């Protein structure tokens, strides 16, 4: 997250921190995700496509820090890693960038809700906030495009939804953005998602309900003029989500 503010997991208790174990034993951060039911985390396919083996991954819930344990956290293996079969790496602008992780602890259990671990509601189909609506994004991604390190503390910021009409302009993203995607940016371009934020939640309040409107997917650089962050439009994937969460 470029700009924005530090936070702790209490302020985004559905946030899932996803890591990969390397041959040699080293564990590195991969991407964010969101808990949508006790056994299911939703994220982005591009985070996993190069290493599709479920045994490679570790998922934490209730974690506020990147390389330190948070009191009360839960650790999970990935029982199933489900990538969207129509994924395409189309020059930055990934299509169908959505993935599901069925989580299971060493003891064979799913998530247990607490003050630091809670699910996020899915939207109604094709029901998204009006453009110009302020939404929030959360993650452990870079604080500056030029940084080498990721922040140790979780961050969040606010971005505004951008119409498909505005985002499809040639001076924005042209044909790279589809109706299954959502653009969001800051009016001053001063805050944004960045590398490492992929897979995490874009949350909007619709009708009083905090809703998983988007999943961090792609963008040209970070916090750059006329280059919004781009998000998978969750409300266009409900049948995919419902079928695969029975697996």
């Amino acid at each position: 997250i470029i700009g924005g503010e530090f936070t702790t997991i209490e302020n985004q208790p559905w946030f899932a921190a996803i890591y990969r174990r390397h041959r040699g034993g080293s564990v590195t951060y991969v991407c964010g995700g969101s808990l949508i039911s006790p056994c299911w985390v939703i994220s982005a396919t591009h985070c996993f496509i190069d290493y599709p083996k479920k045994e490679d991954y570790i998922v934490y819930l209730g974690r506020s820090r990147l390389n330190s344990n948070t009191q009360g956290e839960m650790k999970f293996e990935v029982e199933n890693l489900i990538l969207h079969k129509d994924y395409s790496a189309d020059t930055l602008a990934h299509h169908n960038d959505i993935a599901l992780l069925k989580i299971r602890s060493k003891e064979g259990r799913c998530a247990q809700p607490s003050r630091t671990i809670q699910t996020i509601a899915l939207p109604s189909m094709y029901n998204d906030p009006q453009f110009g609506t302020s939404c929030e994004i959360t993650g452990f991604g870079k604080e500056q495009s030029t940084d080498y390190l990721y922040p140790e503390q979780l961050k969040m910021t606010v971005v505004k939804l951008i119409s498909h009409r505005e985002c499809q302009q040639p001076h924005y993203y042209g044909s790279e953005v589809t109706t299954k995607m959502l653009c969001a940016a800051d009016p001053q371009w001063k805050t944004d998602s960045c590398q490492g934020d992929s897979g995490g939640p874009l949350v909007c309040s619709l009708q009083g309900r905090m809703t998983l409107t988007g999943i961090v997917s792609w963008g040209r650089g970070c916090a750059l003029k006329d280059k919004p962050g781009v998000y998978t439009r969750v409300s266009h994937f409900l049948p995919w989500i419902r079928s695969h969460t029975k697996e």
Side-chain angles (χ1 to χ4, degrees):
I1 305 286
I2 314 299
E5 57 196 73
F6 291 101
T7 192
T8 52
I9 197 65
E10 292 84 354
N11 298 321
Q12 199 84 176
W14 45 91
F15 183 80
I18 310 167
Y19 301 76
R20 179 172 66 88
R21 305 171 92 269
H22 296 233
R23 14 264 193 260
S26 184
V27 172
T28 56
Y29 189 71
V30 176
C31 281
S34 302
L35 190 73
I36 58 165
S37 72
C39 305
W40 292 96
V41 168
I42 199 164
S43 187
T45 281
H46 88 252
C47 291
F48 310 104
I49 191 68
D50 290 350
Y51 299 92
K53 185 178 179 174
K54 64 184 180 193
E55 295 86 3
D56 291 352
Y57 295 94
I58 307 176
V59 181
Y60 293 86
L61 298 173
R63 193 169 168 115
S64 295
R65 286 193 69 89
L66 209 200
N67 292 299
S68 298
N69 302 318
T70 294
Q71 185 163 250
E73 73 178 23
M74 291 187 309
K75 183 185 184 177
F76 304 89
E77 297 299 316
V78 178
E79 185 183 352
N80 305 97
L81 178 54
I82 298 167
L83 309 182
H84 191 115
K85 286 179 175 60
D86 301 318
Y87 176 76
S88 52
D90 291 333
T91 63
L92 210 190
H94 312 300
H95 289 209
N96 303 300
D97 198 10
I98 193 166
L100 286 159
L101 299 86
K102 192 177 193 180
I103 55 167
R104 196 173 71 89
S105 67
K106 279 289 182 73
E107 299 76 33
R109 285 188 276 264
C110 300
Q112 303 171 245
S114 68
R115 204 164 75 187
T116 54
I117 301 172
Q118 308 169 209
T119 60
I120 181 69
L122 292 173
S124 301
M125 218 168 38
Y126 297 87
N127 176 31
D128 299 308
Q130 208 146 222
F131 300 106
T133 299
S134 292
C135 301
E136 64 195 30
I137 51 170
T138 302
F140 286 116
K142 286 184 184 190
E143 298 198 72
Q144 297 184 298
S145 292
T146 58
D147 287 351
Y148 185 40
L149 293 160
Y150 286 10
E152 281 300 325
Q153 187 74 39
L154 191 63
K155 293 186 75 183
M156 64 185 314
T157 197
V158 168
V159 288
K160 292 191 166 184
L161 281 358
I162 293 168
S163 70
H164 185 244
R165 178 191 181 266
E166 188 169 27
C167 213
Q168 76 177 348
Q169 292 175 285
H171 79 282
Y172 277 55
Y173 287 133
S175 62
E176 287 171 356
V177 292
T178 67
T179 61
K180 291 173 207 175
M181 299 171 198
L182 289 169
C183 295
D186 179 79
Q188 289 266 5
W189 311 98
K190 76 178 176 142
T191 184
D192 199 1
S193 55
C194 204
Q195 182 190 325
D197 289 318
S198 286
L202 172 77
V203 170
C204 310
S205 180
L206 289 89
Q207 308 137 212
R209 187 177 196 89
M210 297 288 270
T211 301
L212 199 38
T213 295
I215 294 166
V216 181
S217 177
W218 65 272
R220 169 157 147 172
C222 308
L224 281 173
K225 182 168 178 186
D226 296 342
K227 303 298 173 201
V230 191
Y231 299 82
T232 300
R233 194 173 194 169
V234 176
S235 75
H236 285 46
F237 289 89
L238 302 179
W240 184 88
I241 294 166
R242 272 179 300 158
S243 66
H244 298 267
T245 51
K246 299 186 291 175
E247 307 195 348

